[PDB]
Design a protein around this ligand. Structure first.
Ligand SMILES: [Mg+2]
Ligand SMILES: [Zn+2]
Lengths: 49, 49, 1104, 97, 146, 97, 98
DNA sequence: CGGCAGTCGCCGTCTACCTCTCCAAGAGCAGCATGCGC
DNA sequence: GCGCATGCTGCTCTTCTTTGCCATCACGGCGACTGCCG
RNA sequence: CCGAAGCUUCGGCUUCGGCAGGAGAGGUA
């Protein structure tokens, strides 16, 4: 819901997520940018870090 | 559409009043598209990313 | 010419002019003259069509009254507006931050029908802002301009659309009112005519005819031929007027039972009323001109009638048929066709008078509602006109219009041309027009009806392209709001000299010839066939025997700024657009000089702007100094004119006036007495003449850059003064009150030498960035005072040229609470440097790339360096070849020429005048915009120019010269183009655009850096800039850019300490904006939590 | 010697692709304008009639290493969408050659 | 269409009774600041008025209920309180917007999350930064590619 | 806090019990701020008791004004003696009738 | 600016305005030229069922396709086709071709 | 019951930067302070 | 000399939506829905 | 966080003083 709420239609996605009790695993570029972590690409992946 | 009457004078000899007036319909279209098509282009980019 | 004292500028024109351009500011002043009701407009209206000299305020005051109550026992009326004298002059209003206004009084009478007595007395209705002699308003000390608005006219508008399935042509009418309902008849795809009263589904139209009072007999008589009308009739089955009435009330009254009297009250309180529908005079006219009803009769009675409805339906069904002519019983024959909604015969102009009258009407209506409601709660025999009238709504409406409004705009005073152009602008936006998003692509096009009324070239370049335009030089406005343009009447194939003004709706029934048409000595056309303009803007080549009208001049279709570009017909439209837009951004320079090549419009564009001083009468000059001129008239009266020395304009430039007369001259009325900001001997001069070469040079002029010489810096050729203003206050705080004094405890005596024994700097002190201008200590009622001293904002300097202190102890109008307001001024002489923007009149534009020593510059055979170098790669691909012709003509004018006529005039000089066959060095010429110098004439003049001091001709017959190389010494292998060109300095200087920041102020909610250059802000790292970082693969740069440089509150300080101490940068934490987002989501009753790998939600609040 | 071998990042808006951000090595000049190499104007799409650009400063060791290795202008010559060279002679250089 | 909603309230461990409110949260004060307008007064906060409206209506309802009022008046007050809360959470969705000074519609709690000028696309995906500058670019032909 | 320990982000509907849980007190008076004393009102929308002290290590009265008395609740005012940054993270609630 | 709309109607996949019926089976074709609407019926040469493509507007020019012999000509009643063959001129539906 | 077609509401419409002005007030409810009358 | 009346002045809200005011708002895509006809 | 003033053993300690939101218009690439 974090990646879809910042694209379009915030109210609808937030309402559906609230009803369904969804969980976000924070495993994308946008979510890691939003919360302030290293993106999983380039030099931020486990082999190079 | 194309106006039947052509512009037979070059810019080295100078257009007349009527030719200059009918020539202004194609320099405004390009300038409105420069400031309107870029909206669709931006939207497309953002949706593709 | 036509000006008493003017420079002798010889002209290349071959055509004569039968008309002179009108006053260039009469579009602003005429409307206010009509609104005020002054005798000047009364006489002008008495000149032609003297029927109803009704002012602007008088018609509102007469439409309002009488005001009656529900019982019908008393009434109130108004009459006789009149104005007093203006309280304070213009300069006082601009100085003390006041408004330029005059009180307004009206007379009101109160009649009591029960008794019969009358009580009348004079009431006061507030101060009315007034317009100065230049067409501007001074509101709270700032100059303002009200801009005219382009709106649709109130009338009938038939259209036509096709379907997608059957693809048949369905029509749709639309009676648009001025303020009221919205009838909208239409036809459909089957065969049913339907009305949609007040936007509510649909219905049959026979029900509406029945509801008006029509029956089967009359209906089926008026609607014969039309099979659609028969089908429409036989479907409703409404057996009686009652049926129709009840149905109307049923549909238009939801959640209510349909009544009979209420239906006959609705369909009476909707259209045929007087306070619920009001087709104004434009409406009545434009409805009586299409349908063709009552001609000859006036335009009184402005409410709809059954007649119009009927004629409308007639029109619609006959257009569905095909009948190309229609006659309504009792009228004229009118053609039947569809109409365009963007024709300048349907679009009208709402000037300043009709923009102020609307607000006055709104305030009047509010006051009328208040008095009507209060007339029934007071006791009789104690009711007087002064106790029934409230002034507050009217003054509130006036001050809301003249302040926070989209059409009363801040005036731009970069130079006289921009100020003149601002007052001639037609804007299509505003409260009643369009929107930047709703407007499409068909309202931003050059309609064929703009010829002579709007300029097709001068328009903005951004999102307002086509929504803002400029009026043409010869255009003028109807008493209704329709723009006119002049023509010359022709009879029997000979052009006369009688001028008739025609609107765009009347010139489509005549054949109009072209200005550039060969005319013999008697006035007969030479060419067998002429180029004309037919009905629908169709250009054709008809044999010359049908012409009915003719143009007045070739420059009839251009505005006042486009008519100042020489060789305009050789330029593309886009480049002329940029040249016209960039002529309004030039800055005034310390010394001015007139163009070598001009157009002739520059003389009357400076007198009409109003930034010069002209003499109002004839006399001899008595005394001349640097700041006043005294003129003794012939009768005996003496008049003295003062000057504005080093005044600050709206944009920070300098406005300086200088006298150009001697101590014994004879002066004629209208002669220019003093110069102005951008004026040279009475004519506008925005730039300087420089010697040019067109060639590449080592890549320093790569991609639109410019190379300058050092002689332009050592001789102050391009230098401008800029003045800036600052201010401080002394508003009594809670404990005690602030008091400006030299005593600033916490500061020493070093940074106190300037401040005199009062606390203010001394006129003449040079300030830097950090200097204290005026020092103030806010106390507590010492060891409680603060350091609150006015300082010079970062990156600003210059000498203090003046102060202005206002105090209430000497009796002055200061905002309550404040006790001291000082205003300091600082001026800085700015030179030219790298990064500054230059321009020409043809679209040339670039920033200065390099400034070279005078010994490093290419030089002619006699050792003359060139002043500017331009690249040759940008000319051919942009189609602005007027600049090369301008350089050729400028060289010819500078050097001077002489044509030999020993064996008669040469063949190429047959059509030249007799005064252009010889010229002196440093001559001034003029080439009009569409009738000027041909190219055979230029080619012949380039081989006649005079030599220099030594008998040498530097530029050969092609306009090319051989230059030497100033760095290596060898001559360049090929000849290069040399000449003179007119270069202006634009108001985009690099000293106002440089910015940098390490740390500074931060925001409050989301602790990110502030924004803007005045607040020492940071630069946005937007969304598109993150995609590039993620595509590069840089995972650490992005994290550092987003956490420890923007939001990580605890990491910012540790990062700064680590950098200063030389240690390693720490690991980023968590941004604060995320926590703000979480509290935002939690405030909408959403249970959002941050979990760990095994549940057990983290607190996420620190504190430990 | 403070600004010796310390790269900076230059950006011009709009940033339509990757090459809208590049890392250079600063030099001190006299004036108030930034000097740009003639061969990066194709990637930046920047003429010289009034454009403006922004500067950013890397701080840590990882950011400096990324700027010096991944983003240097002399390492990004080929276009990433078609493989054609972008830093090529054009306009005046083509006529001279 | 209905099963998508009826099954969400069954598969998880939530309840359908969270759609009816009995207490309303209040945002922390430092997220809706009120500051002086240049030594004068305070000029609106766009969020401290919708709270005042809710509190006023709730107080009037409490006083009227604990007095023995007739049913019609209590129903009117309850409807008005419902409308005020609806305007607090989403202004303009139903009926007409609640305006302030100058006929300018007020901005609700859900207007700080939506649009291109909301929190998500203007504060979380792009920010303002330190150590940055700006100027006009000019051509230098003596430089190298780096 | 460490960002390297987050693993999930759960959202869901909130009940009245949760709303009464998060809150530190209930607001009753529509008052906003005291114009004369320039101090927050009582039981208003800016009250110091519900939300937190306006100044560092201070309270409504003047019994505690130092940094060594933190953690003690004022017995005549009710205001905690702690930092003023707690006004960005403490909420309240309104009890509907 | 005339190309962009089709790059949208392609990516953001909708049903193309100017649709063109495609063939499902394989064999000869029919064509019931009426007034403004052909009705191509197709003749499955495998022995199945003729799919009566109805309301095939007359405006659309018939697909100029190389017929089985080799005649690059419009789809004429009596022309063998196969699975996928476009029957009219225009952009095919990305959801039918799947 | 069963199709059915108009209709009505909600979603979206490129990035970065600069300059200026303007942002509820009168009515009403007490709370006295001094002048005037008996 | 005391009581009553009327004007400076603190002092804290208050600002709707009928039979009124108000005037409108592009253009395309999508999905429910809802009265309406059979 | 910055400034002023004291003790200062040179790590630092103490007193006082201090803030930044919206709407509209025009413009450059
Ligand atoms: Mg450019
Ligand atoms: Zn206390």
């Amino acid at each position: 819901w974090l990646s879809a709420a910042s694209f379009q239609e915030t109210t609808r996605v937030l309402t559906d997520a609230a009803i369904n009790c969804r969980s976000d695993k924070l495993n994308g570029l946008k979510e890691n940018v939003i919360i302030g972590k290293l993106i999983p690409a380039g030099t931020g992946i486990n082999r190079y870090r | 559409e194309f106006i039947p009457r052509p512009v037979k004078s070059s810019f080295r000899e100078g257009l007349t009043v009527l030719e200059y007036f009918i020539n202004t319909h194609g320099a405004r279209k390009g300038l409105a598209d420069t400031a309107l098509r870029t909206a669709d282009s931006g939207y497309l980019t953002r949706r593709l990313v | 010419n036509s000006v008493p004292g003017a420079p002798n500028r010889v002209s290349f024109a071959k055509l004569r002019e039968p008309l002179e351009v009108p006053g260039l500011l009469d579009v602003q002043t005429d409307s206010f003259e009509w609104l005020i009701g002054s005798p000047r407009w009364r006489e002008s209206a008495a000149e032609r069509g003297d029927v109803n000299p009704v002012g602007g305020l008088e018609e509102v005051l007469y439409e309002l009254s009488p005001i009656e109550d529900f019982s019908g026992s008393m009434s109130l009326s108004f009459s006789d507006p009149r104005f007093d004298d203006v309280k304070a002059p213009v300069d006082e209003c601009k100085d003390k931050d006041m408004t330029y206004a005059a009180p307004l009084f009206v007379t009101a009478e109160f009649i009591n029908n029960n008794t019969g007595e009358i009580k009348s007395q004079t009431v006061f209705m507030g101060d009315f802002p007034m317009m100065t002699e230049k067409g501007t308003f001074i509101i709270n000390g700032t100059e303002r301009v009200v801009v005219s608005q382009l709106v649709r006219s109130p009338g009938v508008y038939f259209d036509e659309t096709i379907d997608k399935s059957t693809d048949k042509t369905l029509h749709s009418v639309k009676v648009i009112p001025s303020r009221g309902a919205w009838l909208e008849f239409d036809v459909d795809k089957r065969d049913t005519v339907g009305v949609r009263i007040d936007r509510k589904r649909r219905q049959p139209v026979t029900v509406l005819l029945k509801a008006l009072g029509w029956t089967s007999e009359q209906i089926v008589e008026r609607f014969g031929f039309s099979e659609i009308m028969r089908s429409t009739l036989e479907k409703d089955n409404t057996v009686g007027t009652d049926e129709a009435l009840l149905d109307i009330y049923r549909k238009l009254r939801p959640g209510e039972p349909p009544t009979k009297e209420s239906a006959q009250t609705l369909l009476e309180n909707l259209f045929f009323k007087e306070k619920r529908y009001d087709l104004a005079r434009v409406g009545r006219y434009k409805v009586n001109k299409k349908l063709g009803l009552h001609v000859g009769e006036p335009i009184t009675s402005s409410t709809l009638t059954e007649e119009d409805v009927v004629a409308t339906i007639e029109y619609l069904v006959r257009l569905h048929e095909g009948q190309t002519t229609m006659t309504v019983p009792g009228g004229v024959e009118v053609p039947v066709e569809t109409d365009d909604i963007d024709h300048f015969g349907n679009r009208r102009l709402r000037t300043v008078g009709e923009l102020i009258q609307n607000q006055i009407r709104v305030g009047m209506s509010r006051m009328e509602r208040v008095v009507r409601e209060r007339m029934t709660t007071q006791d009789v025999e104690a009711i007087t006109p002064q106790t029934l009238i409230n002034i507050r709504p009217v003054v509130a409406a006036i001050k809301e219009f003249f302040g926070t409004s989209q059409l009363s705009q801040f005036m731009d005073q970069n130079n006289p041309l921009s100020g003149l152009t601002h007052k001639r602008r037609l804007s299509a936006l505003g409260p009643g027009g369009l929107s930047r998003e709703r407007a499409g692509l068909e309202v931003r096009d050059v309609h064929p009806s703009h010829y002579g009324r709007m300029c097709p070239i001068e328009t903005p370049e951004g999102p307002n392209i086509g929504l803002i335009g400029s009026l043409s030089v010869y255009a003028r406005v109807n008493p209704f709001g329709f723009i006119e343009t002049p023509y010359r009447k022709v009879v029997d194939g000979v052009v006369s000299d009688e001028i008739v003004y025609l609107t765009a709706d009347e010139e489509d029934r005549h054949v109009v010839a072209q200005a550039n048409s060969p005319i013999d000595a008697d006035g007969r056309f030479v060419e067998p066939r002429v180029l004309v303009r037919r009905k629908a803007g169709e250009v054709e080549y008809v044999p010359s025997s049908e012409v009915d009208y003719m143009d007045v001049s070739p420059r009839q279709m251009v505005s006042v700024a486009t008519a100042m570009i020489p060789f305009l017909e050789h330029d593309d439209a886009n480049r002329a657009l940029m040249g016209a837009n960039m002529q309004r951004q030039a800055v005034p320079l310390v010394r001015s000089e007139a163009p070598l090549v001009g157009t002739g419009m520059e003389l009357r564009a400076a007198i009409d702007a109003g930034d010069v001083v002209v003499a109002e009468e004839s006399g001899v000059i008595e005394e001349v100094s640097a700041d006043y001129i005294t003129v003794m008239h012939d009768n005996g009266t003496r008049r003295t004119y003062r000057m504005r020395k080093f005044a600050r304009s709206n944009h920070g430039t300098c406005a300086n006036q200088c006298p150009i007369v001697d101590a014994g001259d004879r002066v004629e009325a209208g002669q220019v007495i003093a110069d102005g900001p951008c004026t040279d001997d009475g004519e506008m001069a925005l730039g300087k003449n420089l010697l040019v070469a067109i060639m590449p040079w080592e890549g320093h002029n790569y991609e639109d850059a410019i190379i300058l010489s050092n002689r332009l810096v050592e001789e102050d050729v391009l230098t401008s003064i800029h003045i800036e203003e600052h201010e401080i206050d002394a508003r009594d705080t809670k404990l005690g009150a602030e008091e400006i004094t030299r005593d600033i405890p916490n500061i020493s005596d070093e940074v106190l030498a300037d401040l005199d024994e009062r606390g203010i700097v001394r006129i003449g002190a040079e300030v830097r960035d950090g200097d204290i201008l005026v020092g103030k200590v806010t106390p507590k009622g010492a060891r409680e005072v603060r350091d609150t001293s006015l300082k010079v904002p970062h990156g600003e300097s210059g000498k203090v040229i003046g102060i202005r202190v206002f105090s209430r102890e000497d009796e002055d109008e200061l905002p309550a609470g404040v006790n001291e307001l000082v205003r300091v001024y600082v001026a800085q002489k700015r030179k030219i440097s790298d990064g500054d923007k230059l321009a020409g009149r043809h679209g040339n534009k670039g920033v200065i790339g390099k400034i070279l020593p005078v010994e490093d510059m290419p030089f002619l055979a006699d050792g003359t360096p060139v002043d500017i170098i331009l690249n040759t790669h940008g000319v051919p691909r942009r189609m602005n070849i007027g600049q090369i012709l301008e350089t050729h003509l400028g060289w010819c004018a500078h050097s001077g020429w002489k044509v030999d006529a020993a064996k008669g005039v040469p063949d190429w000089a047959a059509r030249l005048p007799d005064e252009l066959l010889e010229a002196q060095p440093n001559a001034i010429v003029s080439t009009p915009v569409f009738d000027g110098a041909q190219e055979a004439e230029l080619q012949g003049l380039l081989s006649c120019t005079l030599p220099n001091r030594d008998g040498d001709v530097l530029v050969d017959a092609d306009g090319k010269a051989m230059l030497f190389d100033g760095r290596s010494g060898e001559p360049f292998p090929y000849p290069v183009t040399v000449g003179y060109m007119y270069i202006m300095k634009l108001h985009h200087l690099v000293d106002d655009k440089i910015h940098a920041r390490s740390t500074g102020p931060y925001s409050m909610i989301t602790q990110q850096p502030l924004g803007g250059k005045a607040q020492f802000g940071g630069q946005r790292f937007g969304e598109m800039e993150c995609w590039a970082m993620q595509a590069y693969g840089a995972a650490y740069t992005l994290q550092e850019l987003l956490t420890i440089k923007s939001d990580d509150t605890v990491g910012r300080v540790k990062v700064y300490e680590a950098i200063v101490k030389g240690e390693n940068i720490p690991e980023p934490g968590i941004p604060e904006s995320f926590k703000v987002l979480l509290k935002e989501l939690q405030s909408l009753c959403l249970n959002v939590e941050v979990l760990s790998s095994d549940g057990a939600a983290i607190e996420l609040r620190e504190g430990e | 010697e403070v600004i010796a071998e310390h790269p900076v990042l230059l950006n011009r808006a709009p940033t339509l692709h990757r090459l809208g951000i590049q890392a250079f090595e600063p030099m001190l000049v006299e004036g108030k304008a930034i000097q740009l190499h003639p061969l990066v104007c194709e990637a930046f799409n920047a003429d010289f009639d009034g454009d403006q650009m922004a500067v950013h400063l890397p701080l840590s060791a990882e950011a400096q290493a990324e700027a010096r290795i991944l983003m240097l202008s002399s390492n990004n010559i080929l276009s990433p969408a078609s493989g054609r060279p972008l830093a090529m002679p054009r306009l005046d250089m083509v006529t001279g050659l | 269409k209905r099963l998508k909603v009826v099954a969400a309230f069954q598969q998880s461990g939530n309840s359908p009774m969270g759609m009816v409110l009995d207490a309303v949260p209040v945002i922390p004060p430092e997220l809706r600041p009120m500051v002086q307008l240049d030594g004068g007064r305070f000029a609106t906060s766009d969020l401290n008025d919708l709270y005042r409206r809710v509190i006023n209506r709730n107080n009037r309802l409490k006083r009227l209920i604990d007095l023995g009022a007739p049913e019609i008046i209590v129903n009117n007050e309850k409807r008005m309180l419902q409308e005020s809360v609806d305007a607090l959470f989403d202004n303009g969705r139903r009926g007409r917007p609640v305006t302030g000074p100058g006929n300018r519609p007020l901005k609700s709690l859900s207007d700080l999350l939506k649009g291109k000028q909301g929190r998500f696309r203007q504060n979380l995906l792009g920010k303002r930064v330190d150590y940055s500058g700006r100027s006009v670019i000019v051509v230098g032909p003596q430089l190298k590619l780096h | 806090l460490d960002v390297n320990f987050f693993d999930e982000l759960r959202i869901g509907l909130a009940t009245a019990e949760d709303i009464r849980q998060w809150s530190y007190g209930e607001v009753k008076k529509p008052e906003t701020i005291n114009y004369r004393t320039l101090k927050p009102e009582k039981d208003g929308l800016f009250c110091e008791k519900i939300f937190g002290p306006t100044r560092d290590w201070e309270c409504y009265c003047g019994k505690y004004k130092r940094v060594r008395f933190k953690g003690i609740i004022c017995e005549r005012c009710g205001v905690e003696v702690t930092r003023a940054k707690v006004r960005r993270e403490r909420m309240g609630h309104i009890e509907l009738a | 600016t005339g190309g962009l709309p089709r790059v949208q109607e392609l990516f953001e996949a909708r049903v193309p305005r100017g649709k063109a019926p495609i063939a499902d089976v394989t064999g000869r074709v029919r064509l019931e030229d009426g007034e403004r609407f052909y009705k191509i019926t197709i003749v499955p040469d495998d022995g199945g069922e003729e799919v009566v493509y109805d309301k095939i507007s007359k405006r659309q020019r018939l697909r100029v396709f190389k017929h089985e012999d080799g005649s690059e000509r419009v789809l004429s009643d009596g022309d063998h086709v196969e699975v996928g063959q476009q029957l009219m001129e225009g952009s095919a539906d990305p959801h039918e071709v799947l």
